[PDB]
């Protein structure tokens, strides 16, 4: 009598960011929006591969895409548009009955602090991945339906209580609890410094002469929307022995650390979804994790 | 001293691609030799050989099956069954743009020869296919061998048929040496004693099984000897090239 998940069950992304375009401004005249071009440089060094103490001194020439602030502007600006979409339990590819019993298994999830963690990850500047390391201050300006919100000092590791993140998260959770959508026009101003080096997203190219190739929109330095969205959904502090917020994944998995924080401890998304559709009463953190996966999206079947 | 008339880019569609039971595709040299003797009958210009090349040729269908023809209820006495679909006997159809080059011997001006060949081709039918279009035929002569090659290269671009001969049989060498098989003629099995259901009552008739030779496609300029591309009626109830087996 177990309610098996359909193979075709798939949820769409309901937090849609745009490609985060990266401009250069000063800290005073932020309207002087000059775009940061990706340049290409070729750099000489040494090959210091772990298992090669022979090629060590031979030399190493690498062609890398670089992006820097110009030497007349000390502030990096990052412009993007988060798009929180409601209707969060209607799986656009899933079955009707399984998605309906998952919806009526997850009506009581606290959307307020889910939306607070999303808007906090926007406001504290987690969408600036390496662009926050080394900065006098990080000013986040979010336009939410003709309402400008200003953010100066927010520690990104823990989700502190403040009234502006809660104010934006009020209509973000109102969207995520029901229908409609809300658009967050985000502008980040990092006082990086005069001629400082900025960190755009890097593309994967297989057979290319470039060692590192950055993402460029018509030549302008930019971040990928998936990197920005990963930084939105980096809210998971509810897994086993949680010390830092990780990205919401179906297996709680990060690739760089080489460990899945929710695989092998029956806290992965699929076990809690099968528990939700089979009468196991979920916890508040557990429901919040499952709903965060449902608005991250993904196909969950087979 | 040799004379030729070339009809270039003979776009023909509706070609009966069923060359035989085991060959479907390009019409064989028996078809084009039959076309040559057809003009020997209608126009009176008696034709020794025909060299034919394929500019374009597509058999209607997929890469493994030909598109069958929706048959029409045309036999007598099967009314009542006419509302249902007619049964399909296998006849693949094809389209083809050809280039033909007829060895003729002529004693008048080239204009009346061109007009006679044009008036034939306007009423002709290449392999059961309606001749959709054709360029104005032009007369070229092969006084010597360099002039023979001039006529040869005047059929550009086309893939002519060269005979490569039978070693053991058709299937074996088609896999081994990878050459194409086609009908070079027929083999007579039995005399036909009933001439009532035939085209003529006086012309002697035989049941036949198509003999095949193995052939290759080479572009007309890459053919060294034009006599190896000119097919003609041999005296073995078959057709053959003037130059014999292509080497």
């Amino acid at each position: 009598t177990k309610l098996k998940a359909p193979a075709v069950l798939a949820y769409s992304r309901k937090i849609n960011p745009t490609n985060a375009l990266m401009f250069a401004v000063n800290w005073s005249d932020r309207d002087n929006t000059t775009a940061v071009m990706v340049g290409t440089k070729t750099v000489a060094g040494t090959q210091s591969v772990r298992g090669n103490p022979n090629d060590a001194d031979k030399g190493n020439i690498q062609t890398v895409n670089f992006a820097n602030l110009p030497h007349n502007k000390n502030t990096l600006l990052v412009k993007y548009n988060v798009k929180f979409v409601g209707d969060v339990f209607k799986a656009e590819l899933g079955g009707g009955e399984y998605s309906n019993t998952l919806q009526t298994a997850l009506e009581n999830t606290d959307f307020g602090t889910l939306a607070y963690r999303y808007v906090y990850n926007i406001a504290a500047g987690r969408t600036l991945w390496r662009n926050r390391v080394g900065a006098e201050s990080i000013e986040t300006v979010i336009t939410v339906n003709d309402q400008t919100f200003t953010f100066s000092d927010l520690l990104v590791n823990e989700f502190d209580e403040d009234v502006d993140v809660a104010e934006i998260a009020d209509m973000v959770a109102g969207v995520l609890s029901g229908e409609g959508f809300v658009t967050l026009k985000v502008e980040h101003y990092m006082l990086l410094g005069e001629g400082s080096e900025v960190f755009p997203s890097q593309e994967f190219v297989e057979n290319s002469k470039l060692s590192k190739q950055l993402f460029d929109l018509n030549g302008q330095a930019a971040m990928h929307d998936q990197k920005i969205g990963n930084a939105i959904r980096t809210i998971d502090t509810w897994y086993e022995d949680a010390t830092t917020p990780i990205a919401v994944e179906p297996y709680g998995s990060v690739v760089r650390n080489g460990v899945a924080y929710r695989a092998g401890n029956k806290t992965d998304l699929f076990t809690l979804m099968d528990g939700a559709v089979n009468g196991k009463s979920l916890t508040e953190e557990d429901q919040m994790f499952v709903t965060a996966n449902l608005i991250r999206g993904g196909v969950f079947g087979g | 001293m040799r004379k030729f008339i070339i009809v270039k880019n003979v776009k023909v569609d509706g070609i009966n691609a069923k060359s035989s039971d085991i060959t479907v595709g390009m019409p064989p040299a028996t078809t084009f030799c039959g076309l040559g003797e057809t003009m020997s009958i209608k126009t009176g210009i008696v034709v020794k050989a025909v060299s034919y090349g394929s500019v374009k040729f597509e058999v209607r269908g997929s890469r493994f099956n030909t598109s069958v023809t929706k048959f029409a209820w045309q036999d007598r006495g099967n009314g009542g069954k006419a509302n249902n679909n007619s049964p399909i006997q296998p006849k693949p159809l094809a389209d083809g743009v050809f280039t033909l080059c007829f060895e003729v011997e002529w004693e008048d001006c080239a204009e009346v020869l061109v007009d006679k060949v044009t008036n034939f081709i306007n009423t002709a039918r290449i392999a059961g296919g309606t001749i959709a279009s054709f360029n104005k035929p032009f007369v070229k002569v092969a006084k010597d061998a360099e002039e023979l090659a001039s006529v040869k290269n005047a059929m550009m671009p086309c893939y002519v048929v060269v005979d490569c001969g039978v070693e053991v049989n058709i299937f074996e060498d088609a896999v081994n040496r990878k050459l194409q098989p086609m009908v070079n003629g027929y083999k007579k099995l039995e005399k036909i004693v009933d001439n009532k259901h035939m085209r003529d009552k006086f012309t002697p008739a035989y049941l036949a099984t198509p003999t095949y030779t193995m052939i290759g496609y080479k572009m007309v300029s890459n053919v060294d000897n034009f006599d190896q591309a000119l097919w003609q009626y041999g005296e073995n109830t078959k057709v053959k090239t003037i130059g014999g087996i292509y080497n």
């Binding site: - | 390009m26 394929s54 500019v55 374009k56 269908g61 030909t66 198509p210």
Partner: protein
């Protein structure tokens, strides 16, 4: 020729010669045609006699 049809189908399926067409001869139910069409229902192998094309853009 019947030997050509049957032996060619068997050989060109045996010797992996795939430059061919396949035709079921009798139709929907080939037992009214011929015993070989009745039994070899997969169709007879005939030679794909298409010549090479001339590319127009040259």
């Amino acid at each position: 020729n019947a030997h050509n049809l049957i032996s060619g189908t068997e050989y060109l399926w045996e010797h992996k010669y795939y430059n061919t067409f396949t035709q079921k001869l009798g139709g929907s139910n080939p037992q009214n045609c011929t015993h070989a069409c009745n039994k070899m229902r997969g169709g007879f192998k005939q030679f794909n006699c298409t010549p090479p094309q001339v590319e127009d853009n040259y």
